[PDB]
Amino acid sequence: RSGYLQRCIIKHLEGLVVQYDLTVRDSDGSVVQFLYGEDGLDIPKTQFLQPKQFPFLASNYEVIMKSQHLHEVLSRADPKKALHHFRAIKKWQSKHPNTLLRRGAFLSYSQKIQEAVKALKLESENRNGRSPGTQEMLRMWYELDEESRRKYQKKAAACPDPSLSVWRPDIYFASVSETFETKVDDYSQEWAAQTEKSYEKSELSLDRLRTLLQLKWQRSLCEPGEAVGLLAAQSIGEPSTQMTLN
Amino acid sequence: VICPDMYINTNEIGIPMVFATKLTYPQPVTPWNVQELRQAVINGPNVHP
Amino acid sequence: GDEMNAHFPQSELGRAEAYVLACTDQQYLVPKDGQPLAGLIQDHMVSGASMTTRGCFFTREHYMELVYRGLTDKVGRVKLLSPSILKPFPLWTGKQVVSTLLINIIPEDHIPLNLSGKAKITGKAWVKETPRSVPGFNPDSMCESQVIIREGELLCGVLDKAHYGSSAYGLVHCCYEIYGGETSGKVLTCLARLFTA
Amino acid sequence: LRGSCLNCHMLTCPRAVIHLLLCQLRVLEVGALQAVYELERILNRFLEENPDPSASEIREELEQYTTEIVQNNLLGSQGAHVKNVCESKSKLIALFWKAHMNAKRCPHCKTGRSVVRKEHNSKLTITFPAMVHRTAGQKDSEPLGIEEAQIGKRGYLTPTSAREHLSALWKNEGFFLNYLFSGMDDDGMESRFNPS
Amino acid sequence: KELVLNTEGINLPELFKYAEVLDLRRLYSNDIHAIANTYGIEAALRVIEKEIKDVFAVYGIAVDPRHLSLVADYMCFEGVYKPLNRFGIRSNSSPLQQMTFETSFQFLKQATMLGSHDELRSPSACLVVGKVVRGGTGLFEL
Amino acid sequence: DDEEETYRLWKIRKTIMQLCHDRGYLVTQDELDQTLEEFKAQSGDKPSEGRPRRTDLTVLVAHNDDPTDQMFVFFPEEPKVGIKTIKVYCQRMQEENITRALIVVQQGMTPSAKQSLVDMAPKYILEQFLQQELLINITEHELVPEHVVMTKEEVTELLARYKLRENQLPRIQAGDPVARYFGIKRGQVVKIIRPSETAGRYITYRLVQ
Amino acid sequence: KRITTPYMTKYERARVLGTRALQIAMCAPVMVELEGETDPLLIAMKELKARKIPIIIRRYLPDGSYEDWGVDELIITD
Amino acid sequence: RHMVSDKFQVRTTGARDRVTNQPIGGRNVQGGIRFGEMERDALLAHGTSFLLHDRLFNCSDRSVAHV
């Protein structure tokens, strides 16, 4: 039974070649997606990047640095964007507790002037598209000076779009995804404070570690060239064959 | 047909004499590959290599 | 009883794409999830658990014998080690032995490597009834359940199914990730040979 | 042939949907999608234009969008060929076949249209319609011929009669069946299709 | 510990009448179509993936959550929800891979009635013509 | 049953406030977060308050563009709305010169009314909305992403970056409830911020078709 | 700049080492002094690590427009 | 006993088919290999064209034709 299921599923998607734009395309100039799965990682060693496999590249550091030839690659990458961009994102998140909330131009302004317009007793007819203590402020905002307007309408736009989205992680250094920068940051401020309060011979600084993990990331992305469609075809084909436990 | 045996590599299979003797590979004889292809044209299809 | 098809490329192109694109050396793991595919075989695992355990004393000539048997002569100048114990006769220990295979098999360029993971047999596989009631010491550390390889010289603990086996966080597992493929494959074959001889 | 008519020799579907799908196909001939979806709010009629029109809907939206998409770097003498257009064209030609097989009566002349049957040895047969069609057609020329017979008028249709039938069909609807039979632009051949 | 009840059957519009004793935000159907028209397509995905996962999960197998989030954004990228045994794969630029699928004649007929000039990127086309193809090794030359 | 009728009225009022704000038209914060029992102050009983048009919030003004446009909200009472009311508010809109209106029924709408919409459409785009469609949001839900509508300059920056055609973007017909929730028509692109768990927070451009 | 990455794509190194073992297999000048083993599969490491590769790699961008890359410009590394 | 006749098969060059110019099988005139549906699907699957161009094109039925 599971064999016949494999043979049915073998009639499948065939021609999905990840082009040199690092967006998974198809045979016919079509663009089926933008970033494989999440991006790049076909789980070649993704069993090894994220989880608790750092206390192994903490040791063995120097080989993983030299053999990887970091100086051989520092003059062909700029680690600038990934810092400013991430710091701005950090600030945005630190000041915006619950992003999941309607917030616009003068919503905050209304929360602010609500105390005043509740103070003043400006009542009228429930006329068209409003209540009494509303229409007045609705007009007030018009003759407001554009300075407070600009002040508010600055803090209205999103924490900017993801790093991976604007910076293609092949060219630009240190293009980590959100739930992995949290991981490297986790371990940074979780080991240093550990080792200093440990015996700590450990010749290594809190930035070589960062550069190292980032190079392992950039290394672990799947090169253009491999047709991902057949990959998925087999990867569902194997449980299509392994269905036979029952 | 195949058999479970040890003395070959996990990255190497040992072929019997029939397929190692009959099957060949082409190469123009340059001043550097002389001895190998010479002994090959010496032995031929009866003895390996 | 199933069959097997053999093939040989006429040009260097197919040959080399079989050498490297199709090999088990740099395709050592399963890219479906990133765990090894060509681990070590079971018959060469009871051997492992036999040598590397807390005592198996070889005198000199035996030591040099095993080390040459399991070393696929292509080498050149072979390195050595020093007697673990030195009092009566220059004895050895098996860990010292298997370390030699690394020290000669991990190329001259780089340096051997650390690890402190775990091993399949628990600490309580050979336990006995009850200790002389004493605190301070614990059966938890200074035990033989955890390989502690430091600079390519195993120091405590057996080699159980985990490491030479095809699982995450193994010996042939990590060798491949940071050295390349060919050296991991060489480790596998030579270690198996020692384990048979 | 099952989607056709016998009296007027046209398709069983009305001419309005045929013309609408003709415009839709001429759009698909480069591959446009958003314009396929935006043409539907407007209806289509015969090829004519005049200043200050009456209450009617035009077709030259087709040609103006054609020249527009040629003007800005997105149409050449070859034609565009992508995936989404392949899905859209497959689905729309499948729906045209569905409309072929989902039409029994002719809104043009209200004829009988005796149904035809296929055979697995490349043969076609004619089936005489039921009494409902003969009584519902008209007092004028009916599918019942000038003859009296018992139940069952199934007879073999000669390939010359089917040949002239498809000949009339094609000389009528070439403007649609040429673009249906030419996925790319017909600039190099610019010829008409023959049912032979 | 979000207490659950166990319903069966799909009429979403009705569930709303009870509006204050349930959590109408975390609510997904077993159907892939009842929510399709009520919420969207980005609606459909997460549930498609939940279902494939669990159908493998009652045995123990589970593919990595990258294959799933691939096979979604091809079997549904034109809004509607298509199958792939024949329907979705019909959208293949090359009718020759389909010729390889089930019956050569049908998709030869497709190629003859359509008359497309294949751009020669798909594996089927440039493999049968005799060149080197974009597959794997063959995107580039010297 | 009047209880439940004003219950549904207030539900609709809240969610239409939310649709307005999400649509990007100035609504003050007190409004959105308004108690049903506080809304009970602005209007009362089922017959006492005049159900049909004692609450038509026809007046909230497009403001970021220019404080001139002000879309319309309606609340008829004939369960299958005839075309007569349609001509009534054709008049009301030509008299006041607004081109954006929204309708609400409680059973549906007569087909001929929906047709009489179509021909007046070019400026008279009056969105049909069964009361059921706006029972509760489609945006407040876990799996459903958050959309934003891009301008043509940013779509242009995109198409420049990737060097692609418009026949390669993913595609969607407007009938999908989320599409109408905003009012996108065709030939527009809405990126998607759909979260993930592999890494998270994709960005993908979808073409309305 | 390039919207590819200076870095070693495994398919590139693999396939072009096949191409170079082909090169020195057939009639081809011996750049690096063949220190024993005639086979350019064993001397291919020598070729590469000595950087005797004037080979032109025609990396093809999404459609048509390509790049050319001599293998030294990459990050060939352990 | 032999549960199946365990004899082997091998071929490099020799007499091929007449109308197709393809290596015949049989094991008694030194037959060759067969590539069915599943092997060709694997070949579609690996992502290689040069292998096909080398085996199916150069080795199986190479013939210098003229148009």
mmCIF file with all atom_site columns, N, CA and C in Angstrom, chain D residues 30-35 37-38 40-41 74 80-86, chain F residues 118-122 165-169 171 173 186-188 207-209:
data_model
loop_
_atom_site.group_PDB
_atom_site.id
_atom_site.type_symbol
_atom_site.label_atom_id
_atom_site.label_alt_id
_atom_site.label_comp_id
_atom_site.label_asym_id
_atom_site.label_entity_id
_atom_site.label_seq_id
_atom_site.pdbx_PDB_ins_code
_atom_site.Cartn_x
_atom_site.Cartn_y
_atom_site.Cartn_z
_atom_site.occupancy
_atom_site.B_iso_or_equiv
_atom_site.pdbx_formal_charge
_atom_site.auth_seq_id
_atom_site.auth_comp_id
_atom_site.auth_asym_id
_atom_site.auth_atom_id
_atom_site.pdbx_PDB_model_num
ATOM 1   N N  . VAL D 1 30  ? -1.263  37.287 -25.006 1.00 0.00 ? 30  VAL D N  1
ATOM 2   C CA . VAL D 1 30  ? -0.029  37.764 -24.400 1.00 0.00 ? 30  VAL D CA 1
ATOM 3   C C  . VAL D 1 30  ? 0.130   37.232 -22.981 1.00 0.00 ? 30  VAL D C  1
ATOM 4   N N  . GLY D 1 31  ? -0.976  37.071 -22.268 1.00 0.00 ? 31  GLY D N  1
ATOM 5   C CA . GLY D 1 31  ? -0.974  36.502 -20.944 1.00 0.00 ? 31  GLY D CA 1
ATOM 6   C C  . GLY D 1 31  ? -1.572  37.335 -19.823 1.00 0.00 ? 31  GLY D C  1
ATOM 7   N N  . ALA D 1 32  ? -2.251  38.436 -20.130 1.00 0.00 ? 32  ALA D N  1
ATOM 8   C CA . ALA D 1 32  ? -2.703  39.360 -19.099 1.00 0.00 ? 32  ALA D CA 1
ATOM 9   C C  . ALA D 1 32  ? -3.721  38.686 -18.189 1.00 0.00 ? 32  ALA D C  1
ATOM 10  N N  . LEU D 1 33  ? -3.729  39.088 -16.917 1.00 0.00 ? 33  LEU D N  1
ATOM 11  C CA . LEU D 1 33  ? -4.651  38.544 -15.928 1.00 0.00 ? 33  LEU D CA 1
ATOM 12  C C  . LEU D 1 33  ? -5.546  39.615 -15.305 1.00 0.00 ? 33  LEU D C  1
ATOM 13  N N  . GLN D 1 34  ? -4.946  40.697 -14.800 1.00 0.00 ? 34  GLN D N  1
ATOM 14  C CA . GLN D 1 34  ? -5.730  41.761 -14.175 1.00 0.00 ? 34  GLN D CA 1
ATOM 15  C C  . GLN D 1 34  ? -6.697  42.390 -15.168 1.00 0.00 ? 34  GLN D C  1
ATOM 16  N N  . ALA D 1 35  ? -6.325  42.425 -16.448 1.00 0.00 ? 35  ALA D N  1
ATOM 17  C CA . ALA D 1 35  ? -7.231  42.965 -17.454 1.00 0.00 ? 35  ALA D CA 1
ATOM 18  C C  . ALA D 1 35  ? -8.297  41.956 -17.861 1.00 0.00 ? 35  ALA D C  1
ATOM 19  N N  . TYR D 1 37  ? -9.605  40.131 -15.740 1.00 0.00 ? 37  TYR D N  1
ATOM 20  C CA . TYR D 1 37  ? -10.539 40.290 -14.635 1.00 0.00 ? 37  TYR D CA 1
ATOM 21  C C  . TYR D 1 37  ? -11.251 41.641 -14.662 1.00 0.00 ? 37  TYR D C  1
ATOM 22  N N  . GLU D 1 38  ? -10.658 42.660 -15.293 1.00 0.00 ? 38  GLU D N  1
ATOM 23  C CA . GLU D 1 38  ? -11.286 43.982 -15.324 1.00 0.00 ? 38  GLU D CA 1
ATOM 24  C C  . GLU D 1 38  ? -12.204 44.201 -16.532 1.00 0.00 ? 38  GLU D C  1
ATOM 25  N N  . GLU D 1 40  ? -14.670 42.303 -17.423 1.00 0.00 ? 40  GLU D N  1
ATOM 26  C CA . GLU D 1 40  ? -15.971 41.648 -17.283 1.00 0.00 ? 40  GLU D CA 1
ATOM 27  C C  . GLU D 1 40  ? -17.078 42.623 -16.894 1.00 0.00 ? 40  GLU D C  1
ATOM 28  N N  . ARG D 1 41  ? -16.741 43.719 -16.208 1.00 0.00 ? 41  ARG D N  1
ATOM 29  C CA . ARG D 1 41  ? -17.765 44.691 -15.832 1.00 0.00 ? 41  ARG D CA 1
ATOM 30  C C  . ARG D 1 41  ? -18.380 45.363 -17.055 1.00 0.00 ? 41  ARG D C  1
ATOM 31  N N  . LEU D 1 74  ? 6.422   45.533 -22.350 1.00 0.00 ? 74  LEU D N  1
ATOM 32  C CA . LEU D 1 74  ? 5.818   44.285 -21.904 1.00 0.00 ? 74  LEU D CA 1
ATOM 33  C C  . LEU D 1 74  ? 5.102   43.495 -22.991 1.00 0.00 ? 74  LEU D C  1
ATOM 34  N N  . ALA D 1 80  ? 4.354   36.766 -24.392 1.00 0.00 ? 80  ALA D N  1
ATOM 35  C CA . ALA D 1 80  ? 4.804   36.335 -23.080 1.00 0.00 ? 80  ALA D CA 1
ATOM 36  C C  . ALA D 1 80  ? 4.270   34.939 -22.768 1.00 0.00 ? 80  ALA D C  1
ATOM 37  N N  . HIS D 1 81  ? 5.042   34.189 -21.976 1.00 0.00 ? 81  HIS D N  1
ATOM 38  C CA . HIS D 1 81  ? 4.718   32.796 -21.663 1.00 0.00 ? 81  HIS D CA 1
ATOM 39  C C  . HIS D 1 81  ? 5.189   32.532 -20.230 1.00 0.00 ? 81  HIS D C  1
ATOM 40  N N  . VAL D 1 82  ? 4.224   32.430 -19.305 1.00 0.00 ? 82  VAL D N  1
ATOM 41  C CA . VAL D 1 82  ? 4.500   32.257 -17.883 1.00 0.00 ? 82  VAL D CA 1
ATOM 42  C C  . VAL D 1 82  ? 3.615   31.128 -17.355 1.00 0.00 ? 82  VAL D C  1
ATOM 43  N N  . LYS D 1 83  ? 3.652   30.937 -16.032 1.00 0.00 ? 83  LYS D N  1
ATOM 44  C CA . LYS D 1 83  ? 2.908   29.850 -15.404 1.00 0.00 ? 83  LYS D CA 1
ATOM 45  C C  . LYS D 1 83  ? 1.462   30.241 -15.133 1.00 0.00 ? 83  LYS D C  1
ATOM 46  N N  . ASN D 1 84  ? 1.250   31.402 -14.506 1.00 0.00 ? 84  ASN D N  1
ATOM 47  C CA . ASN D 1 84  ? -0.106  31.809 -14.155 1.00 0.00 ? 84  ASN D CA 1
ATOM 48  C C  . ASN D 1 84  ? -0.995  31.901 -15.390 1.00 0.00 ? 84  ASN D C  1
ATOM 49  N N  . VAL D 1 85  ? -0.446  32.368 -16.514 1.00 0.00 ? 85  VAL D N  1
ATOM 50  C CA . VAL D 1 85  ? -1.212  32.347 -17.755 1.00 0.00 ? 85  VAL D CA 1
ATOM 51  C C  . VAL D 1 85  ? -1.474  30.920 -18.206 1.00 0.00 ? 85  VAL D C  1
ATOM 52  N N  . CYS D 1 86  ? -0.579  29.978 -17.899 1.00 0.00 ? 86  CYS D N  1
ATOM 53  C CA . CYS D 1 86  ? -0.831  28.598 -18.299 1.00 0.00 ? 86  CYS D CA 1
ATOM 54  C C  . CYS D 1 86  ? -2.005  28.022 -17.518 1.00 0.00 ? 86  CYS D C  1
ATOM 55  N N  . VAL F 2 118 ? -24.626 47.890 -10.549 1.00 0.00 ? 118 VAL F N  1
ATOM 56  C CA . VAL F 2 118 ? -23.488 47.671 -11.434 1.00 0.00 ? 118 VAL F CA 1
ATOM 57  C C  . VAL F 2 118 ? -23.356 48.810 -12.433 1.00 0.00 ? 118 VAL F C  1
ATOM 58  N N  . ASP F 2 119 ? -24.475 49.256 -12.998 1.00 0.00 ? 119 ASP F N  1
ATOM 59  C CA . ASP F 2 119 ? -24.399 50.241 -14.068 1.00 0.00 ? 119 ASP F CA 1
ATOM 60  C C  . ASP F 2 119 ? -24.028 51.625 -13.537 1.00 0.00 ? 119 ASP F C  1
ATOM 61  N N  . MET F 2 120 ? -24.473 51.965 -12.324 1.00 0.00 ? 120 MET F N  1
ATOM 62  C CA . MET F 2 120 ? -24.123 53.267 -11.757 1.00 0.00 ? 120 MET F CA 1
ATOM 63  C C  . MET F 2 120 ? -22.712 53.265 -11.182 1.00 0.00 ? 120 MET F C  1
ATOM 64  N N  . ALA F 2 121 ? -22.062 52.103 -11.155 1.00 0.00 ? 121 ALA F N  1
ATOM 65  C CA . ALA F 2 121 ? -20.810 51.884 -10.436 1.00 0.00 ? 121 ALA F CA 1
ATOM 66  C C  . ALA F 2 121 ? -19.738 52.959 -10.621 1.00 0.00 ? 121 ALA F C  1
ATOM 67  N N  . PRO F 2 122 ? -19.332 53.327 -11.882 1.00 0.00 ? 122 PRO F N  1
ATOM 68  C CA . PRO F 2 122 ? -18.039 54.014 -12.092 1.00 0.00 ? 122 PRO F CA 1
ATOM 69  C C  . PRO F 2 122 ? -17.610 54.989 -11.006 1.00 0.00 ? 122 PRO F C  1
ATOM 70  N N  . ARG F 2 165 ? 8.003   40.269 -14.105 1.00 0.00 ? 165 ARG F N  1
ATOM 71  C CA . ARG F 2 165 ? 6.760   40.730 -14.696 1.00 0.00 ? 165 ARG F CA 1
ATOM 72  C C  . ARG F 2 165 ? 5.660   40.736 -13.641 1.00 0.00 ? 165 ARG F C  1
ATOM 73  N N  . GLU F 2 166 ? 4.489   41.234 -14.018 1.00 0.00 ? 166 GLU F N  1
ATOM 74  C CA . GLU F 2 166 ? 3.332   41.133 -13.147 1.00 0.00 ? 166 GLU F CA 1
ATOM 75  C C  . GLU F 2 166 ? 2.646   39.785 -13.256 1.00 0.00 ? 166 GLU F C  1
ATOM 76  N N  . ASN F 2 167 ? 3.085   38.922 -14.173 1.00 0.00 ? 167 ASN F N  1
ATOM 77  C CA . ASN F 2 167 ? 2.545   37.575 -14.301 1.00 0.00 ? 167 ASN F CA 1
ATOM 78  C C  . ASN F 2 167 ? 3.332   36.558 -13.493 1.00 0.00 ? 167 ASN F C  1
ATOM 79  N N  . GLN F 2 168 ? 3.994   36.993 -12.435 1.00 0.00 ? 168 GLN F N  1
ATOM 80  C CA . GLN F 2 168 ? 4.699   36.076 -11.569 1.00 0.00 ? 168 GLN F CA 1
ATOM 81  C C  . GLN F 2 168 ? 4.363   36.273 -10.105 1.00 0.00 ? 168 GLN F C  1
ATOM 82  N N  . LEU F 2 169 ? 3.638   37.324 -9.751  1.00 0.00 ? 169 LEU F N  1
ATOM 83  C CA . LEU F 2 169 ? 3.199   37.515 -8.385  1.00 0.00 ? 169 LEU F CA 1
ATOM 84  C C  . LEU F 2 169 ? 2.039   36.587 -8.067  1.00 0.00 ? 169 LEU F C  1
ATOM 85  N N  . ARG F 2 171 ? -1.650  35.658 -6.685  1.00 0.00 ? 171 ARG F N  1
ATOM 86  C CA . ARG F 2 171 ? -2.821  36.333 -7.225  1.00 0.00 ? 171 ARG F CA 1
ATOM 87  C C  . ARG F 2 171 ? -4.065  36.009 -6.403  1.00 0.00 ? 171 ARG F C  1
ATOM 88  N N  . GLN F 2 173 ? -8.543  36.946 -6.361  1.00 0.00 ? 173 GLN F N  1
ATOM 89  C CA . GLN F 2 173 ? -9.753  37.643 -6.768  1.00 0.00 ? 173 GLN F CA 1
ATOM 90  C C  . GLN F 2 173 ? -10.385 38.360 -5.581  1.00 0.00 ? 173 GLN F C  1
ATOM 91  N N  . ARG F 2 186 ? -8.245  45.679 -8.259  1.00 0.00 ? 186 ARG F N  1
ATOM 92  C CA . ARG F 2 186 ? -7.513  44.904 -9.247  1.00 0.00 ? 186 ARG F CA 1
ATOM 93  C C  . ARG F 2 186 ? -6.247  45.642 -9.638  1.00 0.00 ? 186 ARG F C  1
ATOM 94  N N  . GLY F 2 187 ? -5.217  44.884 -9.990  1.00 0.00 ? 187 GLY F N  1
ATOM 95  C CA . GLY F 2 187 ? -3.975  45.511 -10.401 1.00 0.00 ? 187 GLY F CA 1
ATOM 96  C C  . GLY F 2 187 ? -3.265  46.231 -9.284  1.00 0.00 ? 187 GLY F C  1
ATOM 97  N N  . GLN F 2 188 ? -3.574  45.876 -8.042  1.00 0.00 ? 188 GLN F N  1
ATOM 98  C CA . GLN F 2 188 ? -2.940  46.437 -6.863  1.00 0.00 ? 188 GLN F CA 1
ATOM 99  C C  . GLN F 2 188 ? -2.203  45.314 -6.154  1.00 0.00 ? 188 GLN F C  1
ATOM 100 N N  . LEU F 2 207 ? -0.841  39.971 -5.718  1.00 0.00 ? 207 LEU F N  1
ATOM 101 C CA . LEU F 2 207 ? -1.487  40.780 -6.739  1.00 0.00 ? 207 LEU F CA 1
ATOM 102 C C  . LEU F 2 207 ? -2.969  40.448 -6.780  1.00 0.00 ? 207 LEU F C  1
ATOM 103 N N  . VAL F 2 208 ? -3.812  41.469 -6.646  1.00 0.00 ? 208 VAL F N  1
ATOM 104 C CA . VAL F 2 208 ? -5.258  41.262 -6.606  1.00 0.00 ? 208 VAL F CA 1
ATOM 105 C C  . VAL F 2 208 ? -5.701  40.902 -8.019  1.00 0.00 ? 208 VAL F C  1
ATOM 106 N N  . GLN F 2 209 ? -6.155  39.667 -8.212  1.00 0.00 ? 209 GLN F N  1
ATOM 107 C CA . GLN F 2 209 ? -6.657  39.235 -9.512  1.00 0.00 ? 209 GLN F CA 1
ATOM 108 C C  . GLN F 2 209 ? -7.680  38.120 -9.367  1.00 0.00 ? 209 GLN F C  1
#
